[PDB]
Design an enzyme around this catalytic site. Structure first.
Site, short mmCIF file in Angstrom:
data_model
loop_
_atom_site.label_atom_id
_atom_site.label_comp_id
_atom_site.label_asym_id
_atom_site.label_seq_id
_atom_site.Cartn_x
_atom_site.Cartn_y
_atom_site.Cartn_z
N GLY A 1 0.81 -1.23 0.00
CA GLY A 1 0.00 0.00 0.00
C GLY A 1 0.83 1.27 0.00
O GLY A 1 1.99 1.25 -0.46
N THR B 1 0.74 4.91 4.84
CA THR B 1 0.13 3.91 5.71
C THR B 1 1.16 2.90 6.20
O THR B 1 1.16 2.50 7.36
CB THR B 1 -1.00 3.19 4.96
OG1 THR B 1 -1.93 4.17 4.50
CG2 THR B 1 -1.69 2.15 5.80
N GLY B 2 2.04 2.46 5.31
CA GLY B 2 3.06 1.49 5.69
C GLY B 2 4.00 1.99 6.77
O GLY B 2 4.42 1.24 7.63
N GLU C 1 5.64 -3.26 1.38
CA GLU C 1 5.81 -2.96 -0.03
C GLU C 1 4.95 -1.71 -0.33
O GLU C 1 3.74 -1.75 -0.36
CB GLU C 1 5.43 -4.18 -0.88
CG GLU C 1 5.86 -5.54 -0.32
CD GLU C 1 7.36 -5.71 -0.03
OE1 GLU C 1 8.19 -4.92 -0.51
OE2 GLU C 1 7.71 -6.68 0.70
N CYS D 1 2.42 0.61 -8.77
CA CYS D 1 3.43 1.11 -7.85
C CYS D 1 4.68 1.61 -8.65
O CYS D 1 5.38 2.52 -8.20
CB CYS D 1 3.89 0.00 -6.86
SG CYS D 1 2.61 -1.01 -6.04
#
Ligand SMILES: [Ca+2]
Ligand SMILES: [Ca+2]
Ligand SMILES: [Cl-]
Ligand SMILES: [Cl-]
Lengths: 487, 486
Positions: B220, B224-225, B243, B277
């Site tokens: 994501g 957030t990660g 990731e 991504c």
């Protein structure tokens, strides 16, 4: 003398002076000015400058240098072994083996680099798939006192092979060893800035760990310190941390014909390096009943005859003083705490002299402790735990948040398969000491003993990141286009 | 009944939510989410199933995952249709996502054997044995851009290793996840081995905070990660694989085949409507006549890109972005950058405020004094004009991210310089930046990851090594260490 090694030269530190003392005699071994925050800044800035040209070298040019280092370690073995002995108490016979492990690390690490972080090419439809691995940049290495040559070398050699530069902060309890090691790197032809040495105590460590221009931090030390470091890096996933921490390692004993061989392996496990190896057995689980009782009696017999002496004694002792008078006092205090909780000595630990690190090889029955503290090991205070059946041994063995090493002594291969499948640890041996290991295998603890970045053979993995390419020498249109593309 | 726990579909206790087709705004999936207690039950079920799953023969686990791959290929059109409906992805592209899901399996099996296999070798005192063990229960958080392939890239290797899984899909792709889980069920996965907790923020928080999960595998945003990474600070014992996204540069240098370069730039910036991504956020183009011609040709072709509903006939190159809100957010980002002195080459418009449709847009940001270093999420490509190759390289590397990068250039020397200096995990020459070998590691540097590369190296975070020296015959050594008296 000048004690910091920054940008290819020995320089004088700006921080407070400290000393190391030989725990066997209390004689000073090393004494010098520590690295202040500014010295640390200079060390990191030096590593950063050197990184472009070091990483740009051919792999074989870096390998030629680390191999030269290995050859010089062998040439200078006795002297370096002597420094390890003098400074930390480790017996000269054992200190030599540590130096031998330092030299052997090199060729193994080259093999691991090629296996785990090498370079590969394969045809594919639109080009060539190429895999390369690249160094992170500047890596901080924090060394321990138990293997003050071998364990930092287990970070430094793979880091350098991959093309990283290094800032090395040795344990305040083994600065002399680190100095002697850095001298040999320098004679091996390592370029200016590629390895930098910042000697110091907690302030020097804190300054390095807080530096915003390091790309990795490779740590060998206690779980308490490792965990705080991990917390400190929360929200910075861009820094690679490798945390190789301690344990609460169990050795389970079951029925064997050769009871003396079991005793021998248990003695190695509990008391080699005076119980200061990360993989030393803290808990020895022994069955209730007649066999278990014979094993304990024979273990106490042999352990009571363990000789603890100055590192260069003749005849040579099995173990030396622990790292310091302070550590010896903490172990005795740890025994008194457990006795407070109902433990009962089999061989009581005594500190021979409050000024020195001598404590005897001790065995404490902790069976009657109701809530056994789950605590990291730091010396030769073996805990005996009496169990019923193998299932009970395994449940007890696994009763810990740690997970570095473990072992089983048993003739029954079926007990091994049960044990090994249930046990949760990274190093798990059958009919060997818990401190036995292949130099060419990965070494990583589970639970609080690590952060899933195994070292030794897998050190390569955290020393470089994969860079995957699809390469097409010829730029070309595809013969048929995706929908909605109009040329 | 939208939660999958212990091998059966059960009713969630949490609030009801829905996904909508961003092309039409029609509802696609709707159901009750997983409450905190529902997540507890899912984790308990994964924990119950772990012992028998990990004890199963590797070959028996592999049989089941290979059956899953075969069923994905069989049912490709239906699953691709659900991906398209729910996320906007054109059917033609959605088909390829299903194809990658299936291909993941045999590659992950090969990777398992190579990276986390089993080895035996003689030693002086017995036999060195290397095994690898699963962690236990692992939480998998899915994204919306590849709502099948990217979760599958954690799930397949985790399952092969013998972990059990609790899967929390993006709240923007619940239907795709249900459709995937139905296929896992038909593949013969045993009860409790894979559990599905659909939901929004609260479902995700309850799973991430659960103290009985052994790993968390996340795909994501970097935002957030990184918040997850912070949440785990102080808990080194939990395996986190993060990731995340990127601010990926594509450097254009002298090429004869300007149309091929434009094609690769178009694929890099606008495939999946810029939501991969690995999509190029910045296209670096040299000042001068060559660079001017490239930009003109790029704008000419990009101006003819069609965005339409996922099942349009004729098929479009790209779909709507994931939501009307994301569309709105891209147009606002454009206005912010224009405020800092950027100039449109092709201006982005949102077709309809209720829909996710935006056009393929190109914004010249060369005049922006301090260019924001932000994670990409749509088809707003930024042109940056540079001087010489060193300047392009400096600018390309001027980011805290490091997922992908590319060079389009005839000169092999420019490539050598470029690849030795760029800091990224996926770096291509004369291909789009979203070019990747399925059999290679896939991991971003900097804020794009946490040095747990997935794809081929997913095996590495799905199992830990356990190293043994085994001496079946217990024996005293030749000579004793000094100071040992028997
Ligand atoms: Ca545990
Ligand atoms: Ca960067
Ligand atoms: Cl096993
Ligand atoms: Cl390179």
């Amino acid at each position: 003398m000048t004690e910091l090694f920054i940008d290819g030269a020995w320089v004088d530190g700006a921080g407070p002076v400290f000393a190391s003392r030989n725990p066997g005699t209390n004689e000073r071994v090393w004494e010098g000015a520590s690295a202040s925050a500014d010295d640390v800044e200079r060390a990191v800035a030096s590593a950063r400058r050197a990184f472009a040209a070091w990483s740009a070298l051919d792999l074989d040019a870096r390998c030629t240098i680390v191999k030269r280092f290995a050859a010089l370690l062998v040439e200078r073995k006795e002297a370096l072994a002597t420094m390890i002995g003098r400074e930390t108490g480790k017996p000269l016979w054992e200190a030599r083996t540590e130096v031998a492990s330092m030299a052997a690390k090199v060729d193994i690490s080259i093999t691991a680099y090629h296996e785990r972080t090498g370079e590969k090419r394969a045809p594919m439809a639109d080009g060539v798939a190429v895999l390369r691995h690249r160094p992170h940049g500047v890596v901080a290495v924090f060394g321990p006192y138990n293997f003050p040559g071998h364990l930092p070398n287990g970070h430094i050699v793979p880091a350098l092979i991959a093309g990283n530069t290094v800032v090395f902060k040795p344990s305040e309890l083994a600065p002399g060893v680190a100095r002697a090691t850095v001298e040999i790197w320098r004679d091996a032809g390592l370029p200016a800035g590629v390895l930098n040495l910042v000697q110091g105590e907690k302030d020097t460590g804190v300054a390095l760990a807080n530096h915003r221009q390091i790309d990795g931090l490779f740590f060998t030390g206690s779980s308490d310190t490792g965990t705080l470091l991990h917390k400190q890096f929360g929200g910075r996933p861009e820094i690679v941390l490798a945390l190789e921490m301690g344990g609460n390692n169990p050795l389970v004993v079951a029925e064997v014909e050769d009871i003396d061989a079991a005793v021998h392996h248990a003695i190695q496990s509990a008391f080699l390096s005076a119980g200061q190896r990360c993989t030393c057995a803290r808990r020895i689980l022994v069955p209730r009943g007649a066999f278990g009782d014979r094993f304990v009696a024979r273990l106490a017999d042999v352990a009571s005859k363990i000789t603890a002496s100055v590192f260069d004694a003749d005849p040579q002792p099995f173990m030396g003083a622990v790292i310091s008078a302070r550590a010896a006092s903490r172990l005795v205090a740890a025994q008194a705490r457990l006795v407070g909780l109902g433990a009962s000595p089999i061989i009581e630990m005594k500190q021979r002299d409050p000024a020195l690190g001598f404590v005897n090889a001790a065995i404490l029955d902790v069976t009657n402790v109701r809530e056994l503290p789950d605590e990291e090991h730091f010396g030769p205070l073996a805990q005996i735990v009496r169990y019923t059946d193998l299932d009970d041994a395994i449940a007890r063995a696994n009763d810990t948040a740690f997970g570095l090493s473990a072992g089983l002594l048993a003739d029954d291969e079926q007990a091994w398969h049960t044990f090994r499948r249930a046990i949760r640890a990274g190093i798990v041996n059958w009919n060997r000491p818990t401190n036995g290991a292949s130099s060419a295998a990965p070494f990583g603890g589970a639970g609080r003993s690590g952060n899933h970045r195994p070292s030794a053979y897998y050190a390569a993995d955290y020393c470089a990141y994969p860079m995957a390419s699809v390469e097409s020498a010829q730029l070309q249109m595809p013969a048929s286009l995706s929908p909605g593309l109009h040329f």
